[PDB]
Design a protein around this nucleic acid. Structure first.
Ligand code: ZN
Ligand code: ZN
Lengths: 73, 139, 927, 117
RNA sequence: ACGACACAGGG
RNA sequence: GGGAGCUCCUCCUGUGUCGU
C-alpha cells in the first residue's frame, strides 16, 4: 500500500481509543487531540503527519489507563 | 406443500436474526479492547523510528508527562524510572527522544528537589528514589 | 496657445480659481462614464462615451490638484437658451451647481458654452454602477472613489481579498465610510425635488446628473408648467440607488441625537416597540417624492407586491432602531387568577408590528391546543430563564434556560479494517495513485456548535432594487405555473417518519407520533385555522451532525417544533408534492437519477439552444448569507398558489408565521436562546424549494442586469434591442404588470438560457453567442449580482464552463457525467467521486457496521452507486466497482461459513449481487 | 390515543405552572405596568427582571474587559460575581484568572452573577 | 401498486 | 416504538425484507 493512508487510518483509530478513554472530559486536551487528528486527515506530505502522529501517540501514552506491555507483546 | 416451505423460510429468517443479534452484542461488548489491539497492530505496521522509540520508552518506563511538541522552542518533560534507561537515553546534557535532540534544563527528583546532572552517575545512583522527571527543549 | 489661454480665462471668469487644462481646448471624451438613458433608440444602465465636455481641474494654494472640476458642455444654441431659462428658476436652490452661461469664439463664430463649476470627478451613477457591476479585476473607478473620499488608501488595495465580504469583512467599514456622503446626496435630491415642484418643472431625475457632493445639473429634458404644479420623476433614481443605501449604511447618522455623527446615540426607551411614526418620518425625509403608498406595518398592504415594496422600505428603516425592540411582544394573561406571560404579537424588521386577533384574558382553563401554543411560545421559556451575555458570538442572545452551558463534541469515525485490508490486498491505496482517501469523519471539540452558529455574521440587512425585484418575481412566478397547490385538510396530510423529534420543548414528552395521536383531526384543523389569525413564534434546536465529509468544518442541523411542521404541512404539502412529481420542468426535485433519469434531465436542459455551452456556479455561504427580502419573496411565490382558499389576511398571517418560525426565530444552541438574523432553516420542509425559487430569482436578475447594461447602439438584432427597450420600460416605467412582455421575456429566457434547478444547485445551457455579445447572463454577471444582492463574493474558481455537450455538466449534485454506450444508444450516466465511495466503505458511524457480514446490503447500495465507474476510461475507477463486488462475495461466503459452524446447517438469492447485471439494469429504462 | 393525551396534557401544564412560579414577581409586574398598553418586547424581560446573569468569556482579554473584579456593570445594573467555572464545570477562583495563569485553565469561563440591590 | 422496518446516496 | 450513548433533524431518490 502507501504510507499516508496508513497513518490516516491509524490516526482515526488513535482518536477512537482516546475517546473511549474519556478524554472529552478535558476541554484543553480534547481540543488539542481533535486539532492533531483533523490536521493529520488533511495533510498531504508524510513528514508532518508523522510528527502529529508522534504528538497524538504521546497523548495516549502519557496516561496510565491503557497498559502498554501486554499490548506491545 | 407450500406451508412447509413457508415454515422453513420462517425458521431461516428467525435464525439469521438471532445470529445478527449475537454478533452485534459480541462486537458491542468486545470493544475498547479490540480497538487497542488493532491500534497497536497497525502502529507496529507503520515502522517509524519516531513512533517506535516512543513505544519502546513507554513500555520500559520513559513516559512523557505532556504532549510532545513539534516546535523548536517548546518544552518537554518525561519520567526516567531507572538508571539504565537514563545512561543510554541521555549523554551529557543532550536528550534523545522521539528521534529528536533535546537539551536538559532541570532534573527534579521524586520529592521535587533539583538533582544536578553531574551527580547522576552509576556509582552514586542507587541512593535516590529515581522517578527523575527531566525537562528539555528540542534543539 | 492664445485661444486656449483665453478659453481658460473665460472658464474661470469671475469665481477666483486656479485652473489647469485637463485635456485640451477641445472636448475631453471621458473614458466610459456610466449613464442611465432612456430615449427612442436606447435604454439601460450602461457605460457610454461622453464626448461633449471640455473639462478643467482646480488647484488650491501650493499648486496641488483638488477633486473639483469645471465641466464645460458645448451643445447647441436652442438647448443653451432652454437650459439658461430653466436654470434661472432653480438658481436659488442650494442643491444646484453654478452654471455661468457664456459665448466664446471657438471655430470663428460664437459657439455657446455651459460651464458648471466645481462638481467632482465622478457621479452618483458611477458609484452605483461600480458597486453594482463589480468586477474584481477591473475595479478602477471604485478604488479611485474610495481613495478620493478618504475611506481607505492604496495600501488597503495592496492586500489580497480586500473586496471579499467573507474574507476581510473590514470592507464593510471601508464602504460605510461613504454613508454620510450618500445621505447628504439624498438630502440634496429632496431639496432639488422641492425646488422643481415650487418652480413648475417636469423632468426625470437620473443618477448621472448629480455629483458625489449632491449638486444637480443638465436641465436639458425639463419642461415648464404653472408654478407650484411641478412633478419630478424619481423612479429609476431611487430604484437604482437603493442597493447601495444598506451597503454603505447611509442612515447611520439617524441613530445619533441631532442626526450628526458626533453626538451620542439616541437613548431609546426600552419598552418601546412601535416605531411607526419614526418610519413615516424617515420616509418623508429621504423619499418624499417616491409616489407610491408606504405602509410601515405590512399588515395593511394590498397584495404581495405591496408587501414586497413596503418590506423593502422597512428593512431599510429597521437598521435605525434598537435591536432589543424586535421579536415577540409578550403580555400578561390570567389563567384562573394565575398570571401568564405569552406572546400577543410580533415586531418584524420587514413586516412591521403585527398583533394577534384571538387574544383572550381571564380564562378559567387551557385547552389542549392552547397548551401547545403556550408551551411552544418562547415567551414563558425566556421570561423564566437567566440573563445571558455570550461573548463568543456577535449575535443577539436572549436568555440561558439552564444553569450550565452545554459543550457538545463530535466523535471520530470507526475504521472498517477488514474492508481496508481487502482493498490494499487488491492493489488499492498505493503511492501516487488516482484514487485516495479524502472523505473522513472529522471530529469536533466543545467550541464547535457556537462557532458554527456565529457564521450568521454573514447575514447583513440587504435593501433590494424594488422596481427590478417586483419584475423578477413575476418571471419566477411564470417559472412556477405548471404546479398545483393550495391548502389540504388534516386527513390529507402524508406524514412520513412519525417517530422523530418534536422540537423544543416537545421532545421532553414524546415523539411526533405522540402529538399526531393525541390531537384529533379537528384539533389540527383548529390549530391551522388559528395560525391564520395569530403569530406563533417557535424555537428550533441546533445540534451537530455526525457524517462523512471532505472538509474539517462542523455542520449543524436544526430541529423545528411540532407546531411549525404540523401547520406548514397543511399549508405547503400539496404544492411540494406537486413540484416533486413533475418531470420535464426547470426545478428537478424528486426526479430520480436511476433508470435513465439523468439522461432525461440532461436532454431536457439541452432542449433547443442554438450555440449551446454549459455553465454552473455556486453560492458562498448560501444558507447564512441569503437576504431576508429574497426569503420573503420565495415565501410569497410559494403562497401565490392559495388564491381561492385563503384571503389576504390569512395569507399575510401565514407569511408572518413563516417568518417568525423559519426566518428570524429563536435558536436554542446548547442550553441558551439566541436570535437568528436570517437565512434558511435545515429542518424546514420547504427549504429545498425556497432555495430553488431563490436560485431562479438570482438567475433572472443576472439576465436582466446583463441585458440592461449593454450599449443598445451596438446590438445588431432589432428584436433584442426592442426587447431591451421594453425591459427597461417595464422595470422603471409602467408601474403595472405587463403580462404580455412577461411572457415574452420568459420565452426569451427559455429559448436562450435553459436551466436545471435544485436547492441552490443549477446547470445552465445557454446560447454562447448571445452571452459573448452580452444579451444573456455570463459568470461575471452572476458575480456582480451576488456581490450587490447577496453580500458574498463568488469566486470564478468555483464556477465551471463546458464548451462541449457530449461531455456532460462538470458537476451536478456532486455527480459527474459520462457519455456511455448502452445497447446501441449513447446515454449520460452519473458517476460519483471514487474517494467518496471508498470512504463510505472504509469509515462507518457505528461499531457494528464494521462486522461486514451484518451489513451486506450496505455494500450492495454502495455498489449500486459505484457501478457507472466501470465505464470510466481510468482503470482504478472500474477497479473500485469490481472490488465492491468481490467484497460482497467474500462477505456472503464467510457469513455462510459462520452460519454453518455456530448452528447446525443453513441454506439462496444472493448470487445476484456477485454479478453486474443487477446494478447494470439499475441504470436502464424499465421497458 | 386517549391515555397519552391526558399524560402529555398534565406534563405540559405542569411545566407551565412550574416555570410560572419562577417568573411572577415585582420586577415583571413593575416593568409591564409602565408600558402604555401592557405589551412589551420579549428581549427586555430577562434584560430587566432576571435575577441571575451568566457570562461566557472565551479569552482573558474579554474577561479583563467585561467581568474584572467581584462586581461589574452590564445592562445598567450592578452584578455580584459568584461561582465562576470553566468549560469542565470545575470551580475556578478569582485569584487564578491572571494573564500568566491563563493558559493553565480551560476556556471559556462561565461567570454567574446576581443582580445587586 | 400500497404501508411498516433497515440500509445507501444527494441542507 | 425498537436500538444506541437526559438526547437522537428535514426533503428527495433507490435498494432489501417483510403484509395487503
Ligand atoms: Zn403596500
Ligand atoms: Zn391557503
Amino acid at each position: 500500500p502507501s504510507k499516508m493512508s496508513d497513518v490516516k487510518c491509524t490516526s482515526v483509530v488513535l482518536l477512537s481509543v482516546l475517546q473511549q478513554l474519556r478524554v472529552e472530559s478535558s476541554s484543553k486536551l480534547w481540543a488539542q487531540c481533535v486539532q492533531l487528528h483533523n490536521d493529520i486527515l488533511l495533510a498531504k506530505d508524510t513528514t508532518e503527519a508523522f510528527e502529529k502522529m508522534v504528538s497524538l501517540l504521546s497523548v495516549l501514552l502519557s496516561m496510565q489507563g491503557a497498559v502498554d506491555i501486554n499490548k506491545l507483546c | 406443500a407450500a406451508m412447509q416451505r413457508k415454515l422453513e423460510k420462517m425458521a431461516d429468517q428467525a435464525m439469521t436474526q438471532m445470529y445478527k443479534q449475537a454478533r452485534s452484542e459480541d462486537k458491542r461488548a468486545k470493544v475498547t479492547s479490540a480497538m487497542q489491539t488493532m491500534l497497536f497492530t497497525m502502529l507496529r505496521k507503520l515502522d517509524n523510528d519516531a513512533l517506535n522509540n516512543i513505544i519502546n520508552n513507554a513500555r520500559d518506563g520513559c513516559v512523557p508527562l505532556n504532549i510532545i511538541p513539534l516546535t523548536t522552542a517548546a518544552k518537554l518533560m518525561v519520567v526516567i524510572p531507572d538508571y539504565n534507561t537514563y545512561k543510554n537515553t541521555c549523554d551529557g546534557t543532550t536528550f534523545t527522544y522521539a528521534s529528536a535532540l533535546w537539551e536538559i534544563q532541570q532534573v527534579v527528583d521524586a520529592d521535587s528537589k533539583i538533582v544536578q546532572l553531574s551527580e547522576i552517575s552509576m556509582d552514586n545512583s542507587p541512593n535516590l528514589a529515581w522517578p527523575l522527571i527531566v525537562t528539555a527543549l528540542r534543539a | 496657445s492664445a485661444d486656449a489661454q483665453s478659453f481658460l480665462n473665460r472658464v474661470c471668469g469671475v469665481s477666483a480659481a486656479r485652473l489647469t487644462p485637463c485635456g485640451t481646448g477641445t472636448s475631453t471624451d471621458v473614458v466610459y462614464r456610466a449613464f442611465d438613458i432612456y430615449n427612442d433608440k436606447v435604454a439601460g444602465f450602461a457605460k457610454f462615451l461622453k464626448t461633449n465636455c471640455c473639462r478643467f481641474q482646480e488647484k488650491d494654494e501650493d499648486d496641488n490638484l483638488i477633486d473639483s472640476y469645471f465641466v464645460v458642455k458645448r451643445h447647441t444654441f436652442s438647448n443653451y437658451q432652454h437650459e439658461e431659462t430653466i436654470y434661472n428658476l432653480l438658481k436659488d436652490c442650494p442643491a444646484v451647481a453654478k452654471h455661468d452661461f457664456f459665448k466664446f469664439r471657438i471655430d470663428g463664430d460664437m459657439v455657446p458654452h455651459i460651464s458648471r463649476q466645481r462638481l467632482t470627478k465622478y457621479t452618483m451613477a458611477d458609484l452605483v454602477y461600480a458597486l453594482r457591476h463589480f468586477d474584481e479585476g477591473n475595479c478602477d473607478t471604485l478604488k479611485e472613489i474610495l481613495v478620493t473620499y478618504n475611506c481607505c488608501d492604496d495600501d488597503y488595495f495592496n492586500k489580497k481579498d480586500w473586496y471579499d465580504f467573507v474574507e476581510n469583512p473590514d470592507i464593510l467599514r471601508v464602504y460605510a465610510n461613504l454613508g454620510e456622503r450618500v445621505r447628504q446626496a439624498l438630502l440634496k435630491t429632496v431639496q432639488f425635488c422641492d425646488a422643481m415642484r415650487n418652480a413648475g418643472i417636469v423632468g426625470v431625475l437620473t443618477l448621472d446628473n448629480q455629483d458625489l457632493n449632491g449638486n444637480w445639473y443638465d436641465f436639458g429634458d425639463f419642461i415648464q408648467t404653472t408654478p407650484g404644479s411641478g412633478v419630478p420623476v424619481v423612479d429609476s433614481y431611487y430604484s437604482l440607488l437603493m442597493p447601495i443605501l444598506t451597503l454603505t449604511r447611509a442612515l447611520t447618522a439617524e441613530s445619533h441625537v441631532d442626526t450628526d455623527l458626533t453626538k451620542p446615540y439616541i437613548k431609546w426607551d426600552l419598552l418601546k416597540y412601535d416605531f411607526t411614526e419614526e418610519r413615516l418620518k424617515l420616509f418623508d425625509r429621504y423619499f418624499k417624492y417616491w409616489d407610491q403608498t408606504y405602509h410601515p406595518n405590512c399588515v395593511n398592504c394590498l397584495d404581495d407586491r405591496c408587501i414586497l415594496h413596503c418590506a423593502n422600505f422597512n428593512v431599510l428603516f429597521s437598521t435605525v432602531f434598537p435591536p432589543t425592540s424586535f421579536g415577540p411582544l409578550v403580555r400578561k394573561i390570567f389563567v384562573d387568577g394565575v398570571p401568564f406571560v405569552v406572546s400577543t404579537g410580533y415586531h418584524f424588521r420587514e413586516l412591521g408590528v403585527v398583533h394577534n386577533q384571538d387574544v383572550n384574558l381571564h380564562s378559567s382553563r387551557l385547552s389542549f391546543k392552547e397548551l401547545l401554543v403556550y408551551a411552544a411560545d418562547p415567551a414563558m421559556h425566556a421570561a423564566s430563564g437567566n440573563l445571558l451575555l455570550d461573548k463568543r458570538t456577535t449575535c443577539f442572545s436572549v436568555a440561558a434556560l439552564t444553569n450550565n452551558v452545554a459543550f457538545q463534541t463530535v466523535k471520530p469515525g470507526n475504521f472498517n479494517k477488514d474492508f481496508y485490508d481487502f482493498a490494499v490486498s487488491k492493489g488499492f491505496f498505493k503511492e501516487g495513485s488516482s484514487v485516495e482517501l479524502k472523505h473522513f469523519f472529522f471530529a469536533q471539540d466543545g467550541n464547535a456548535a457556537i462557532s458554527d452558529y456565529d457564521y450568521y455574521r454573514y447575514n447583513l440587512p440587504t435593501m433590494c432594487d424594488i422596481r427590478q425585484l417586483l419584475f423578477v418575481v413575476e418571471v419566477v412566478d411564470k417559472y412556477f405555473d405548471c404546479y398545483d397547490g393550495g391548502c389540504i385538510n388534516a386527513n390529507q396530510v402524508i406524514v412520513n417518519n412519525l417517530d422523530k423529534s418534536a422540537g423544543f420543548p416537545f421532545n421532553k414528552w414524546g415523539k411526533a407520533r405522540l402529538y399526531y395521536d393525541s390531537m384529533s383531526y379537528e384539533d389540527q384543523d383548529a390549530l391551522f385555522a388559528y395560525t391564520k389569525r395569530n403569530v406563533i413564534p417557535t424555537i428550533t434546536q441546533m445540534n451537530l451532525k455526525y457524517a462523512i465529509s471532505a472538509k474539517n468544518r462542523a455542520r449543524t442541523v436544526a430541529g423545528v417544533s411540532i407546531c411549525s411542521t404540523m401547520t406548514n404541512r397543511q399549508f405547503h404539502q400539496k404544492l411540494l408534492k406537486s413540484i416533486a412529481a413533475t418531470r420535464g420542468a426547470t426545478v428537478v426535485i424528486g426526479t430520480s437519477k436511476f433508470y435513465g433519469g439523468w439522461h432525461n434531465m440532461l436532454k431536457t436542459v439541452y432542449s433547443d439552444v442554438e450555440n449551446p455551452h454549459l455553465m454552473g456556479w455556486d453560492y458562498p455561504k448560501c444558507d447564512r448569507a441569503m437576504p431576508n427580502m429574497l426569503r420573503i419573496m420565495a415565501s410569497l411565490v410559494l403562497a401565490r398558489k392559495h388564491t381561492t382558499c385563503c384571503s389576504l389576511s390569512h395569507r399575510f398571517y401565514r407569511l408572518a408565521n413563516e417568518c417568525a418560525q423559519v426566518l428570524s426565530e429563536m435558536v436554542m444552541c446548547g442550553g441558551s436562546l439566541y436570535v437568528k438574523p436570517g437565512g434558511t432553516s435545515s429542518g424546514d420542509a420547504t427549504t429545498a424549494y425556497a432555495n430553488s425559487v431563490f436560485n431562479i430569482c438570482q438567475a433572472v436578475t443576472a439576465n436582466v442586469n446583463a441585458l440592461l447594461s449593454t450599449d443598445g447602439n451596438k446590438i445588431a438584432d432589432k428584436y433584442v434591442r426592442n426587447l431591451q427597450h421594453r425591459l427597461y420600460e417595464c422595470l422603471y416605467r409602467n408601474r403595472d404588470v405587463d403580462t404580455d412582455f412577461v411572457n415574452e421575456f420568459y420565452a426569451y429566457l427559455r429559448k436562450h438560457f435553459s436551466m436545471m434547478i435544485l436547492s441552490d444547485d443549477a446547470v445552465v445551457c445557454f446560447n454562447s453567442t448571445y452571452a459573448s455579445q452580452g444579451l444573456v447572463a455570463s459568470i461575471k454577471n452572476f458575480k456582480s449580482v451576488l456581490y450587490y444582492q447577496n453580500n458574498v463574493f463568488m469566486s470564478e474558481a468555483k464556477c465551471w464552463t463546458e464548451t462541449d455537450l457530449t461531455k456532460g455538466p462538470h458537476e451536478f449534485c456532486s455527480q459527474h457525467t459520462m457519455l456511455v454506450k448502452q445497447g446501441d444508444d449513447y446515454v449520460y450516466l452519473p458517476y460519483p467521486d471514487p474517494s467518496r465511495i471508498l470512504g463510505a466503505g472504509c469509515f462507518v458511524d457505528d461499531i457494528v457496521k464494521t462486522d461486514g457480514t451484518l451489513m451486506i446490503e450496505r455494500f450492495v447500495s454502495l455498489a449500486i452507486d459505484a457501478y457507472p465507474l466501470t465505464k470510466h476510461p481510468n482503470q482504478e475507477y472500474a477497479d473500485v466497482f469490481h472490488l465492491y463486488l468481490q467484497y460482497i462475495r467474500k462477505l456472503h461466503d464467510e457469513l455462510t461459513g459462520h452460519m454453518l459452524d455456530m448452528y447446525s446447517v443453513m441454506l439462496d438469492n444472493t448470487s445476484r449481487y456477485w454479478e453486474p447485471e443487477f446494478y447494470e439494469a439499475m441504470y436502464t429504462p424499465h421497458t
